[PDB]
Design a protein around this nucleic acid. Structure first.
Ligand SMILES: [Zn+2]
Ligand SMILES: [Zn+2]
Ligand SMILES: [Zn+2]
Lengths: 1187, 246
DNA sequence: CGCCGGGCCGAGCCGTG
DNA sequence: CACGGCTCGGCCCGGCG
């Protein structure tokens, strides 16, 4: 309504403030431009007009999308392009270029760089082999892979449409075209990079015959081909651009593609539709597990690869792994999980707040984020006691005695995380969110009182039901409000199930199905014949209160109790079952009054439900798996050689190109640079303003032939081509730089002298090769902040979602939050206390205190740059990190070129920068562990300029070519549109899982984001099922990084797997991981005998040793590329694993055999010399051979 | 629960360094007789045998007998922080810590968490040692440093009343002869011709930490391990056992 | 106490996996 | 896409002096 619009008006004001500063500062002519070089937009229309034009196109695109939508308005704009409504482009290929770029831009919503980084060129060719007719040829580039198949595939569609609009002909390849292309398929898939979908060759020729436009471009790898020199293909190497666009594009996403054909009604694609369709008695729970095992196949992708150090947490679909609970906590939900921090500690602190554990069921790539309300592990202490460990602090207390982790406990999967990946719903574990629903439903069908969980009911109903139940009205209030965090004691649970008839409470439900009926039978007899059972009675209900039985009688059943998750202790050779669970171990067993006979075809719960007045539902039925991966980050962004100023220095600084060494050493440089000339005075130098008089200096142009120098206006006349040379005028030239006098002028200008070093750039890679002013380098160094290729300072951080936050968590005063606009918490109540859950507005972000501790330095930088160098008032005045609150930061992805303005509203302690998922989506993230950049606003304004952008390799990172200032979740992304924003999953769902309905069979029930688009109440109110206590509580740095040696890396990685039930190392954590060890050593050994050589100084490595051992230019020696220390690097571990763990003999004999090969490969260079005095400490190799 | 008082902490730190340069962890068999050490390199090429009779200590208080398990690296940095004459004290009570007290001009207290050491005991008594020679420290130290120039394997040759060392590489040649007549050769006990070769690296780890006023014993036979020995305050001496090559 | 030859570490810098 | 080994300067010495 109005609050939200006040919000966006607010951000628009402060952004306008920042632009005021940057326009004044840039106005001084000191920088490469006289204007700010990051335009702001508001929609995808603005993003397309400013990314790829043409001028004015946004105004039209907004209307046409207003009438027809996204897809249709794309093609309409294409028409007005070719119809010249925006002016004359000139040649036909320029109209092709413009319409194709604007088209694909509007189609991907301008958030990626395919329209820029990917599509290399567009050309009009002739079927000179077939009939010489015209067609359209698209030149991609490797970075198109970044923008994924879909945007790639749409590039085809536009390529087909444009040529039709341009009256061009279809393409008609010859069989050499086709077979060379398929060859590119097999080779590129085989050696370069594994395609996501590897199509068959027949499919490849299918597309080759059926795509009227040419999928081509410049070759991407040095891989020669067999169908060389085909007519028109000007290269005989693999074209990864054409290849990827071919395979992972129209092929990998042909379904969605013909969806766009249908939405656009573009003829000539029926073959793709055909390709699409061408590609397309007995107890209750016993039956349920049966159908469950058949319809839902236990995937095994995540366990395919096991890098060393990456733990495996549970075998696929194995009971004992992450018990599953549908839901969506405050943090999780976009693509992450939640998890009880207890299970993050008892796994020896591998997992952190953000370590991307690779999942198997809902989709590969779940981030982890704490959720304290779900139930953490069940462990077995060393002294035999079994302990349920739900909370963090108890986990710290007992981490040392953990003898076995029976149950990893919960993992809160979102629902929409099923909808998108299109997983079949797994049967829901019996969780209180479903219990309480059966509660209120029973009270309605019985006593006609209407309650509702997770809210606040009317007092009358509360008291009435209090009466029919005989329970505290206060207590019933609390249980109805937060059922997760408030559990009625066991006797109330028995009583509720008794009166109301609903099943037993989940929290007191054992894991009865992890035990076959025989075992529980045996336990029944033991209990009946030997236990000592003190009884009790609550409201006429008879329930046990303590059990004790000597371990001699019990014996093997002790394992049974262990599998039932039954918390019990051992004292004096006696098993002790204390109060809150001794009732749970016997109430389902009917207090030992009705005999338990293992009946075939029944699961244990089926029997118990068959003979008990108290009915259960299974608590453990769905079991996800996972394997750790790609742990958290919040580092800085340092270039590979750390940089602190963009000023080419060549070799003159040494290895690290430290400019200050070249200064004090007084050397002189020869580096390509640009010089400007003071028109007033006639001074010349690589700076922008004059030393003599202080006016702006005109660029100097150079002929590479005649070495002619021309001021800018002159070379403007000459069109930047020589008068007496027919060559283009370069802007730069390999020149002579005096680092001394320059750096002296810098220190003179900004008044800073105490720089330890000033690391420069070995060579300008930008097109202009215009160098940054040195003053900025001095200020960076003085504060110790690093730079990135555009001139902006970035800060990678693993991003995770949130949507509601308790101001306790983030360290913010409630008055401050009242100053940012946050009036009322999520239930509408007035914000008064630091423990009410507020709703994060869309573009706010909670930075990690890393980001505070670094962006603080960026603040001191930007101040000292405003004052000392531009001569302006300070702007941040940051002294602690909590001064930044309210100042905008541009969140930017890799692979894209449109950043999103955000506002900071606090800090947490973990290493993960939170944000509203609309933010993380509009930044194009997957939030399956992706990492993002976060620069400060006024920095990126003051220090960015396209002139610094490298000219050729648009890589995985790119720069904020334009910044959005207003989320619209329409043109954000797709993957947001599936979030579950319901306060509690409805009863109909939980019952709807059991028959394994696919998710779309019930999308209409559960609210989502697609079910609020267009309306204003996209931003207004979302919700979440599960509370956390802290967003940051839990081990804040993965144990992976404090592990140095592979030798004991594997000893931790596989130290764990003895602990858990689920993993079963003793045979497969090794052998998977052991298989990895075998491959590296063998590969190195095979390669070693075929290697190359190389000197430190004459990089030139002769594919053979020169007999002398000397080198060119050098009079030196040649080093060995792949050194013998490398071949032997994993024998210690891999031999260890084989001597310890039952591994299949094939891999054992392979390893001992590879030992013998390492020795006999060197029995003539490193002879056997040093005898040893203690021989054969039982090595598996020799002791194996003695067999 | 013991306490121990040793003077000249810098010396003791030196010898503990000596043991340190070959192994990384080790256990100290403290008995009421004295402190004992015995361990072997990772390579199973050298055996360090430390023997410390209680007599050497200015005070020696052991109640029973126990094995200490310590990080030789951490202890090496610690003891290395002592100086020429400051007094060393080693205390241990109930808890699983070792308390090192360096008291010279002042008292300084350190605590070291003891570490479990999987003990692999290999006791190797007297063996057939053809020749046996005593020699000043700096003689052998100089010699090893010389063989470091030309090769990595130093060859020893013991003949009647004459001890000669040698080593040869690609081109260069290194020879060091000396007999009883010579000053540095205190004693020779020639049973017959002996010859061996040893890793110059290991020897360098051995003889570092030897002044001119250091007497060294060397027993060995034809193609078999050397046993080196030298005394420490004339009571507790250290003995290395180096396997030959080839 | 100084120097200087060795030692230990932080830095590229590579490679390959 | 990510690890270890290998070699390189920069401090940090212990011994000669
Ligand atoms: Zn001038
Ligand atoms: Zn010219
Ligand atoms: Zn060379």
């Amino acid at each position: 309504p109005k609050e939200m619009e006040e919000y966006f008006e607010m951000l628009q004001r402060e952004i306008d403030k920042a632009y005021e500063i940057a326009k004044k500062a840039r106005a001084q002519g000191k920088d490469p431009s006289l204007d700010v070089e990051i335009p702001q937009a508001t929609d995808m229309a603005g993003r397309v007009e400013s990314l790829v034009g043409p001028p004015g196109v946004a105004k039209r695109i907004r209307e046409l999308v207003k009438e027809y939508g996204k897809e249709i308005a794309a093609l309409k704009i294409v028409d007005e392009i070719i119809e010249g409504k925006f002016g004359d482009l000139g040649s036909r290929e320029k109209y092709a270029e413009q319409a194709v770029r604007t088209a694909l831009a509007i189609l991907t919503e301008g958030i990626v760089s395919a329209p820029i980084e990917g599509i290399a060129n567009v050309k009009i060719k002739r079927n000179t082999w077939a009939d010489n007719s015209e067609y359209l040829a698209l030149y991609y580039a490797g970075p198109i892979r970044s923008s994924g198949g879909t945007a790639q595939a749409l590039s085809v569609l536009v390529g087909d449409y444009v040529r039709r609009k341009l009256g061009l002909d279809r393409f008609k390849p010859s069989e050499k075209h086709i077979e060379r292309m398929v060859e590119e398929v097999d080779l590129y898939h085989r050696a370069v990079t594994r395609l996501q979908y590897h199509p068959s060759p027949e499919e490849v020729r299918l597309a080759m015959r059926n795509i009227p436009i040419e999928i081509t471009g410049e070759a991407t790898d040095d891989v020669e081909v067999s169908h060389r020199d085909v007519p028109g293909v000007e290269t005989n190497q693999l074209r990864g651009g054409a290849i990827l666009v071919l395979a992972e594009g129209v092929l990998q996403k042909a379904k969605k593609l013909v969806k766009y054909i249908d939405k656009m009604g573009i003829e000539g694609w029926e073959w793709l539709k055909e390709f699409v369709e061408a590609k397309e008695d007995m107890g209750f729970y016993y039956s349920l597990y049966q159908k469950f095992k058949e319809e839902i196949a236990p995937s095994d992708k995540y366990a395919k690869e096991v890098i060393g150090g990456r733990p495996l947490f549970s075998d696929p679909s194995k009971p004992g792994g992450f018990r599953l609970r549908y839901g969506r906590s405050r943090a999780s939900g976009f693509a992450t999980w939640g998890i009880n921090p207890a299970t993050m500690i008892l796994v020896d602190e591998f997992l952190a707040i953000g370590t991307q554990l690779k999942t198997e069921r809902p989709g590969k790539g779940a981030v982890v984020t704490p959720v304290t309300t779900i139930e953490g592990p069940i462990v077995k202490l060393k002294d035999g006691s079994v302990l349920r460990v739900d909370d963090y602090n108890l986990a710290l207390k007992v981490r040392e005695d953990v003898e076995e982790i029976l149950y990893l406990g919960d993992a809160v999967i979102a629902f929409g995380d099923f909808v998108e990946n299109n997983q079949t719903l797994l049967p829901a574990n019996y969780c209180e969110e479903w219990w309480i629903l059966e509660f209120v439903k029973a009270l309605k069908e019985i006593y006609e009182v209407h309650l509702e969980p997770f809210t606040e009911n009317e007092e009358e109903s509360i008291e009435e039901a209090s009466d029919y139940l005989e329970i505290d009205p206060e207590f019933l209030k609390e249980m109805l409000r937060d059922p997760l965090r408030v559990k009625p004691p066991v006797e109330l649970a028995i009583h509720f199930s008794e009166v109301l008839g609903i099943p037993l409470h989940p929290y007191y439900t054992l894991y009865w199905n992890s035990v076959e009926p025989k075992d529980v039978e045996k336990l029944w007899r033991l209990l009946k014949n030997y236990a000592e059972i003190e009884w009790s009675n609550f409201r006429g209900i008879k329930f046990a209160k303590k059990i004790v039985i000597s371990q001699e009688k019990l014996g093997d059943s002790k394992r049974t109790l262990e599998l039932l998750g039954l918390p019990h202790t051992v004292r004096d050779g006696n098993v002790i079952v204390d109060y809150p669970w001794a009732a749970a171990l016997l109430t389902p067993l009917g207090n030992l009054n009705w005999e338990f006979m293992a009946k075939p075809l029944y699961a244990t719960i089926d029997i118990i439900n068959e003979n008990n007045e108290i009915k259960l539902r299974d608590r453990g039925i769905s079991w996800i798996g996972a394997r750790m991966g790609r742990p958290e980050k919040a580092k800085e962004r340092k270039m590979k050689p750390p940089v602190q100023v963009l000023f080419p220095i060549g070799l003159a600084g040494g290895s690290s190109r430290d400019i200050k060494k070249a200064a004090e050493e007084g050397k002189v440089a020869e580096v390509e640079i640009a010089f400007f000339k003071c028109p007033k005075c006639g001074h010349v130098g690589p700076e922008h303003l004059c030393p003599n008089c202080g006016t702006r200096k005109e660029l100097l142009w150079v002929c590479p032939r005649c070495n002619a120098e021309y001021p800018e206006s002159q070379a403007e006349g000459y069109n930047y081509t020589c008068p007496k040379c027919n060559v283009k005028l370069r802007p730069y030239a390999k020149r002579k730089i005096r680092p001394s006098e320059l750096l002296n002028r810098a220190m003179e200008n900004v008044k800073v002298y105490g720089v330890d070093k000033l690391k420069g750039v070995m060579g300008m890679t930008s097109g202009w090769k215009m160098p940054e002013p040195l003053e900025k380098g001095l200020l960076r160094a003085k504060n110790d902040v690093y730079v990135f290729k555009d001139g902006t300072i970035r800060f990678d951080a693993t991003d995770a979602p949130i949507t509601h936050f308790r101001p306790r968590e983030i360290g913010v005063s409630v008055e401050k939050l009242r100053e940012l606009g946050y009036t009322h918490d999520f239930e509408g109540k007035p914000l008064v206390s630091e423990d009410q859950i507020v709703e994060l507005k869309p573009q706010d972000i909670i930075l990690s205190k890393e980001a505070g501790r670094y962006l603080l330095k960026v603040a001191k930088f930007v101040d000292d740059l405003l004052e000392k160098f531009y001569g302006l008032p300070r702007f941040y005045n940051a002294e602690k990190m909590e001064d930044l609150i309210g100042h905008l930061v541009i969140g930017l992805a890799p692979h894209t070129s449109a950043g999103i303005v955000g506002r900071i509203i606090g800090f947490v302690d973990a290493l993960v920068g939170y944000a509203h998922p609309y933010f993380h989506a509009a930044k194009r993230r997957n939030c399956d562990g992706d990492e993002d950049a976060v620069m400060l606003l006024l920095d990126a304004l003051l220090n960015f300029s396209r002139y610094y952008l490298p000219e050729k390799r648009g890589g995985k990172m790119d720069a904020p070519l334009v910044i959005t200032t207003r989320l619209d979740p329409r043109e954000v992304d797709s993957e947001v549109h599936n979030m579950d924003i319901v306060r509690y999953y409805p009863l109909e769902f939980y019952e709807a899982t059991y028959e394994l309905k696919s998710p779309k069979e019930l999308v209409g029930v559960i609210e989502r984001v697609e079910d609020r688009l267009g309306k204003p109440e996209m931003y207004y109110g979302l919700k979440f099922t599960h509370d956390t206590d802290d967003i940051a509580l839990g081990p804040k740095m993965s144990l992976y990084k404090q592990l140095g040696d592979m030798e004991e890396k594997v000893r931790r990685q596989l130290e764990v797997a003895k602990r858990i039930r689920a993993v079963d190392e003793h045979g497969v954590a090794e052998k998977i991981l052991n298989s990895h060890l075998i491959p590296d050593l063998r590969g190195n050994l095979r390669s070693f005998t075929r290697q190359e050589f190389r000197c430190v100084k004459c990089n030139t490595k002769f594919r053979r040793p020169p007999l002398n051992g000397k080198c060119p230019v050098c009079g030196g020696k040649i080093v060995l590329t792949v050194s013998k220390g490398a071949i032997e690097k994993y024998l210690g571990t891999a031999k260890m694993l084989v001597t310890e763990y039952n591994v299949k003999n094939y891999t054992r004999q392979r390893i001992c055999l590879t030992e013998r090969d390492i020795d006999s490969l060197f029995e003539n260079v490193f002879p056997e010399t040093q005898l040893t005095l203690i021989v054969n400490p039982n090595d598996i190799c020799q002791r194996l051979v003695m067999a | 629960p013991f306490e121990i008082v040793f003077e000249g902490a810098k010396e003791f730190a030196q010898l503990i360094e000596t043991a340190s340069r070959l192994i990384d962890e080790a256990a100290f068999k403290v008995t009421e007789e004295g402190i004992s050490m015995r361990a072997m390199d990772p390579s199973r090429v050298v055996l360090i045998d430390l023997n410390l009779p209680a007599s050497i200590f200015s005070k020696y208080e052991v109640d029973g007998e126990e094995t200490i398990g310590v990080n030789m690296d951490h202890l090496k940095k610690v003891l290395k922080r002592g100086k020429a004459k400051e007094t060393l004290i080693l205390r241990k009570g109930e808890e699983n810590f070792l308390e090192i007290s360096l008291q010279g001009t002042a008292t300084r207290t350190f605590k070291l968490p003891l570490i479990d050491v999987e003990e692999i005991e290999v006791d190797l008594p007297e063996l057939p040692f053809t020749a046996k020679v005593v020699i000043l420290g700096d003689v052998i130290k100089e010699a090893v440093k010389d063989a470091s120039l030309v090769s990595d394997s130093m060859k020893f040759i013991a003949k009647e009343n004459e001890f000669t060392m040698r080593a040869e590489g690609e081109t260069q040649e290194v020879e060091v002869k000396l007999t009883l007549e010579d000053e540095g050769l205190l004693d020779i006990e020639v049973q017959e011709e002996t010859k061996s070769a040893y890793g110059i690296s290991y020897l360098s780890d051995m003889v570092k930490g030897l002044g001119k006023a250091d007497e060294v014993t060397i027993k060995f036979g034809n193609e078999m391990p050397m046993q080196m020995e030298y005394y420490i305050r004339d009571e507790g001496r250290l003995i290395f056992l180096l396997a030959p090559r080839v």
